[PDB]
Amino acid sequence: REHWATRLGLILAMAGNAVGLGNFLRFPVQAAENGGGAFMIPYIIAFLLVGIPLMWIEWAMGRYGGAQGHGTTPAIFYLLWRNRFAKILGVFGLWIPLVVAIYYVYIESWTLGFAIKFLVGLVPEPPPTDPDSILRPFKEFLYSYIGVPKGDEPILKPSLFAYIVFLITMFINVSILIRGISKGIERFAKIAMPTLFILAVFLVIRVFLLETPNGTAADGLNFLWTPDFEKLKDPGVWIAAVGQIFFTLSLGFGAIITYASYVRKDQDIVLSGLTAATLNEKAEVILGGSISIPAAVAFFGVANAVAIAKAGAFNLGFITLPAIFSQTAGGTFLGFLWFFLLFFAGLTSSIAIMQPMIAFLEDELKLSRKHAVLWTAAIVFFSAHLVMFLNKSLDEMDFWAGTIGVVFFGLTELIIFFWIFGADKAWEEINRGGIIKVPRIYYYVMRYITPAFLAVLLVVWAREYIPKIMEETHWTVWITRFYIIGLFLFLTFLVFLAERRRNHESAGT
Amino acid sequence: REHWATRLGLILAMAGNAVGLGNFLRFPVQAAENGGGAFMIPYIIAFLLVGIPLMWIEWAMGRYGGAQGHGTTPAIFYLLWRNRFAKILGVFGLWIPLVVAIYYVYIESWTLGFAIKFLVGLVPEPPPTDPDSILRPFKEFLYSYIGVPKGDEPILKPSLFAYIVFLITMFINVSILIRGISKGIERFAKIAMPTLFILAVFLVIRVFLLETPNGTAADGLNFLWTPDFEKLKDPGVWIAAVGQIFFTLSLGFGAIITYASYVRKDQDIVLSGLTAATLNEKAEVILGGSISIPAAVAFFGVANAVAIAKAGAFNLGFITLPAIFSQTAGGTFLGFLWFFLLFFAGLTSSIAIMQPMIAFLEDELKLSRKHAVLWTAAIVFFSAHLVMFLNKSLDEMDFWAGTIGVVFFGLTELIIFFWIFGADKAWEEINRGGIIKVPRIYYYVMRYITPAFLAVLLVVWAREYIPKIMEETHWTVWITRFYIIGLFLFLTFLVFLAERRRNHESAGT
Ligand SMILES: CCCCCCCCO[C@@H]1O[C@H](CO)[C@@H](O)[C@H](O)[C@H]1O
Ligand SMILES: CCCCCCCCO[C@@H]1O[C@H](CO)[C@@H](O)[C@H](O)[C@H]1O
Numbered sequence A, B: 001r002e003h004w005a006t007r008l009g010l011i012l013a014m015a016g017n018a019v020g021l022g023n024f025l026r027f028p029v030q031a032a033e034n035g036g037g038a039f040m041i042p043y044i045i046a047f048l049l050v051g052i053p054l055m056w057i058e059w060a061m062g063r064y065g066g067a068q069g070h071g072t073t074p075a076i077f078y079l080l081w082r083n084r085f086a087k088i089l090g091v092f093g094l095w096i097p098l099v100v101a102i103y104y105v106y107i108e109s110w111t112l113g114f115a116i117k118f119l120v121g122l123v124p125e126p127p128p129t130d131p132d133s134i135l136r137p138f139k140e141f142l143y144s145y146i147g148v149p150k151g152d153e154p155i156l157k158p159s160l161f162a163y164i165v166f167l168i169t170m171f172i173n174v175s176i177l178i179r180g181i182s183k184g185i186e187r188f189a190k191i192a193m194p195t196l197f198i199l200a201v202f203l204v205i206r207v208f209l210l211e212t213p214n215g216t217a218a219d220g221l222n223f224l225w226t227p228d229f230e231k232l233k234d235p236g237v238w239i240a241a242v243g244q245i246f247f248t249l250s251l252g253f254g255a256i257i258t259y260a261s262y263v264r265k266d267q268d269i270v271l272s273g274l275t276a277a278t279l280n281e282k283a284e285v286i287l288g289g290s291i292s293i294p295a296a297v298a299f300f301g302v303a304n305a306v307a308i309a310k311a312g313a314f315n316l317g318f319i320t321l322p323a324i325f326s327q328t329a330g331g332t333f334l335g336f337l338w339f340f341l342l343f344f345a346g347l348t349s350s351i352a353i354m355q356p357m358i359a360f361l362e363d364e365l366k367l368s369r370k371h372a373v374l375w376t377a378a379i380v381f382f383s384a385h386l387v388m389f390l391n392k393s394l395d396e397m398d399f400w401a402g403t404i405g406v407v408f409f410g411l412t413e414l415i416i417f418f419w420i421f422g423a424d425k426a427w428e429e430i431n432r433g434g435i436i437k438v439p440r441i442y443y444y445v446m447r448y449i450t451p452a453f454l455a456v457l458l459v460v461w462a463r464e465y466i467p468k469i470m471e472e473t474h475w476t477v478w479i480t481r482f483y484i485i486g487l488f489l490f491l492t493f494l495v496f497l498a499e500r501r502r503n504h505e506s507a508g509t
């Protein structure tokens, strides 16, 4: 089995895993839609009661599985709970990162395509004051790229450039992953993360200098970091904050687990996991929070910046921000640095969500790294044609895997590790080899508070929020549902083949 | 490896393979649309120049592969041609019967649902002379069953009864296939085929007694068996006749090959294959030809019977015939016997098109029969939800696999066996163990005439007929195309896993 060469490489790879498009695109939208500072109290509490404990659990499960040659949850869940139902629940930790990769790599490719177009100056020129005469050209620019429907048919028409840039993006992911853990993922992370940090700081500084008749960047920071205790009784904010915590830290994705399975059995996971989790939050609240919102608030004021955020997840990052930058000197290049930042942020996360599938093929079906990587790319590339060509397929995949799936899988893996396997065995496995120990209070948080927190959250979700999505959507959602259910069955069949191969292997030695 | 117990069982199983819904539903529609007797000259020539030679080739390939423990074309194509490209072309002989099973078993289930409803008398009552007041209730009866779209959305809404009858149909297929070759397929065929023959003869006799002011059954037989030499210059008729020959004899489906791989290495295939092929043609031209057309012609006259046939493939068998029967004493029960005949005809063919997938899983991935059958059922059952719920998905699958696919695969397997492997080695393999020898002229037919016949046919197809289907269809065809292309990739991945398993097996002994 491969291992992380250096401790820094481990940290930066796990930080690259977490620090992605969730920090710079998703977080600003979530915070703005949910009252800015009103979102932040629930967010900080969710980091403390869910984010930190689950991160530790996933490192522990990972390292534990890796010590026996298993990187993924079908096998690992079985080690912790010797039951057939554990292998089947384990499939979600292959399915979730597979479904996420299918749309996530595609969005990642947009940032590469935009970066190329912004560098070379093939960008829209707004007329040289009206807010709609400035935003519209950039809206049309995004809409032509991805091919937003112009009529009634729920069909997308990606531009030829967008399609080819997706191929290149797939190729860049393959070129890193094919070199492995230490020579691929680890080496790249040591380059990407410093680059990512420098680009983000420069952008924050530039944005901090923005001032118009409508306000300054400081007004954005006031909006984001000013508490509103009247939203603490709103369950919608709590649900939003916990979902962002999961997405942002890569929890319930099976990706922290796969990476941790390359950590040596003896090596520290307590301080290392805390550092990775803390690095992500800095990149999220300080860097990600200080770019999009303050720029939007400076140019448009608070109320218009909120309305922009509610309109679309991609509105703020792909339309509004570049439009704002175009009104400043050197703004096209500043647009390039933004999209380049997003590309590197995405690339380090997409190599993380494809590694579980690769680890499964190597560990359980004994494929070489070359074949495991190429087949994984092939499945992701093929399946992405659904997201590329069917309108709202992306949204459906993001909901079932990236939103519902991750919270469900987070609760599941906590139950399996801390209740079934055993709380005291779990607690010991977490702390073993630790440079620091997990604060004692977290034993009771992990065992009682976190599972009750997530169970109540998921109950309110299924009752008050998902009956609408099951009944008030266009019929084409069943195409995506049909396909991703098929993907689960496919992966189940692979788990079946893996165990039959094991049975023949045990009848041969 | 399993083997057919008796020679009769072999014959009746291979006859059950060929004699299906193609004989009783597809053939009447094809003949009527193409000028009746005008269709028959090309049909007889296609039987002689394509049907007979290819049947022999598929028995030979099958038996040859079976002698080395291989039932399916990925392996068999490789034995005949030791090239990587041969295994990939071999996938079509898993893909075609898999895609065909997905829609064919569903249509088979309609005949079971209709049989149950006709037996119990839950049928429409037409008013006790107007042709539309009689046909409409039966049209509505079929349309409610399968859930034909009432609006603009390309969405089907199967009745609860139809869905449950599909489950039962899947279960009946499983219950036969799970018992194996001799104890399942062979035992059932010895019951089904005699039953099928008796039911068909009784129906022919009953139909022969039909006489109205618009004509008799004899007028139907005159229409069908009267030559029109002015259509012999029409390429559309030739294309139609060859397509029916392929479909009707199960050629290019990989199903004759899989069945033949259970024939002992020494056993006769020349007389046995000719008998099976000849039994099918009797059931097709004498039995299938004498039911639907003569009844339609008796009640409506020739021109109206032709128009009915052009309206739909299911119009004649599921709407018109039962409507005609309802005007006769005991007609509901006669409706039952028709649908019962269709069910048994379908069931013996669907167990044949699922056996390739089962043979692959047993032979190459070393799954037990139980697991191979259940996983095959699972994939077919799951994938059938596409055909059940998306309007015209059935048509798209029938075209790419059941129409284009089979002719392409027929030409491919002939090239591999008679050109690459070697004409003289092929000829020897066919004749070895023969109770009779293949007439010498067929060597030159197999080597020169048949391949040139099919190549010219496929050229005119791609030039004059398929650009319309690629450009003049609704966008929803790309859902079915996307899914069945995914199925090909899935099966390719399984061929990849099968060879990796072989490589580990050869490094273990
Ligand atoms: C291996 C997967 C094949 C699935 C068929 C998808 C064909 C892709 O179609 C391509 O889409 C691009 C983006 O819209 C267009 O610019 C190209 O003209 C078109 O060839
Ligand atoms: C970074 C490498 C990706 C480059 C892909 C180029 C795809 C070609 O894209 C073409 O460009 C033309 C000129 O701009 C346009 O007029 C055409 O509409 C477009 O199809």
Ligand SMILES: CCCCCCCCO[C@@H]1O[C@H](CO)[C@@H](O)[C@H](O)[C@H]1O
Binding pocket: A156, A157, A158, A385, A386, A389, A390, B478, B479, B482
């Ligand atoms: C679920 C996704 C199915 C993949 C279908 C890919 C669409 C390829 O289809 C082609 O796309 C081109 C560009 O969009 C169009 O110009 C062509 O008319 C169309 O045939």
Ligand SMILES: CCCCCCCCO[C@@H]1O[C@H](CO)[C@@H](O)[C@H](O)[C@H]1O
Binding pocket: A048, A049, A438, A439, A440, A441, A442, A445
């Ligand atoms: C759920 C929120 C918990 C976060 C608070 C963590 C602060 C650490 O809490 C510390 O833990 C140490 C080790 O158990 C104790 O020795 C100290 O008394 C205690 O202050």
Ligand SMILES: CCCCCCCCO[C@@H]1O[C@H](CO)[C@@H](O)[C@H](O)[C@H]1O
Binding pocket: A469, A470, A471, A472, A473, A474, A475, A477, A478, A479, B155, B156, B389, B390, B479
């Ligand atoms: C491609 C085949 C899809 C067929 C399934 C469509 C059945 C229509 O079901 C639709 O489902 C939607 C989402 O749950 C709901 O919002 C709609 O109310 C409902 O009409």
Ligand SMILES: CCCCCCCCO[C@@H]1O[C@H](CO)[C@@H](O)[C@H](O)[C@H]1O
Binding pocket: B157, B158, B159, B160, B161, B163, B382, B385
């Ligand atoms: C394992 C495959 C699950 C895919 C979801 C398909 C759910 C089937 O849906 C069923 O369809 C029937 C026929 O229209 C209806 O009569 C039933 O009310 C409905 O439950």
Ligand SMILES: CCCCCCCCO[C@@H]1O[C@H](CO)[C@@H](O)[C@H](O)[C@H]1O
Binding pocket: B116, B160, B161, B164, B165
């Ligand atoms: C042969 C066994 C299959 C029987 C399945 C029965 C499915 C129940 O079907 C129900 O039947 C009712 C009474 O006819 C109808 O009123 C309902 O609309 C229908 O849902």
Ligand SMILES: CCCCCCCCO[C@@H]1O[C@H](CO)[C@@H](O)[C@H](O)[C@H]1O
Binding pocket: A478, A479, A482, B156, B157, B158, B385, B386, B389, B390
């Ligand atoms: C590609 C096929 C996707 C499978 C979708 C199955 C549709 C299940 O969806 C359900 O179907 C019922 C009966 O049609 C409807 O009454 C319900 O509104 C719908 O939710």
Ligand SMILES: CCCCCCCCO[C@@H]1O[C@H](CO)[C@@H](O)[C@H](O)[C@H]1O
Binding pocket: B048, B049, B438, B439, B440, B441, B442, B445
């Ligand atoms: C392509 C149409 C061919 C069908 C005709 C088959 C009739 C059999 O043809 C016979 O073959 C025998 C064995 O080779 C010869 O001994 C006979 O002379 C010949 O009449």
Ligand SMILES: CCCCCCCCO[C@@H]1O[C@H](CO)[C@@H](O)[C@H](O)[C@H]1O
Binding pocket: A155, A156, A389, A390, A479, B469, B470, B471, B472, B473, B474, B475, B477, B478, B479
């Ligand atoms: C589910 C995603 C499907 C997206 C692909 C639809 C692209 C539209 O392409 C359509 O293809 C049809 C069939 O080839 C043609 O008949 C139409 O002319 C064409 O517009």
Ligand code: MET
Binding pocket: A017, A018, A019, A020, A021, A022, A023, A247, A248, A249, A250, A253, A255, A349, A350, A352, A353
């Ligand atoms: C490792 S991919 C999961 C999402 C990622 N943590 C992000 O924030 O973009």
Ligand code: MET
Binding pocket: B017, B018, B019, B020, B021, B022, B023, B247, B248, B249, B250, B253, B255, B349, B350, B352, B353
């Ligand atoms: C063996 S399934 C192929 C079709 C079948 N020969 C029929 O006529 O229905």
Ligand code: NA
Binding pocket: A015, A016, A017, A018, A019, A020, A021, A344, A345, A346, A347, A348, A349, A350
């Ligand atoms: Na990242």
Ligand code: NA
Binding pocket: A018, A019, A020, A021, A022, A023, A247, A248, A249, A250, A280, A284
């Ligand atoms: Na993140």
Ligand code: NA
Binding pocket: B015, B016, B017, B018, B019, B020, B021, B344, B345, B346, B347, B348, B349, B350
């Ligand atoms: Na049959």
Ligand code: NA
Binding pocket: B018, B019, B020, B021, B022, B023, B247, B248, B249, B250, B280, B284
């Ligand atoms: Na037939």
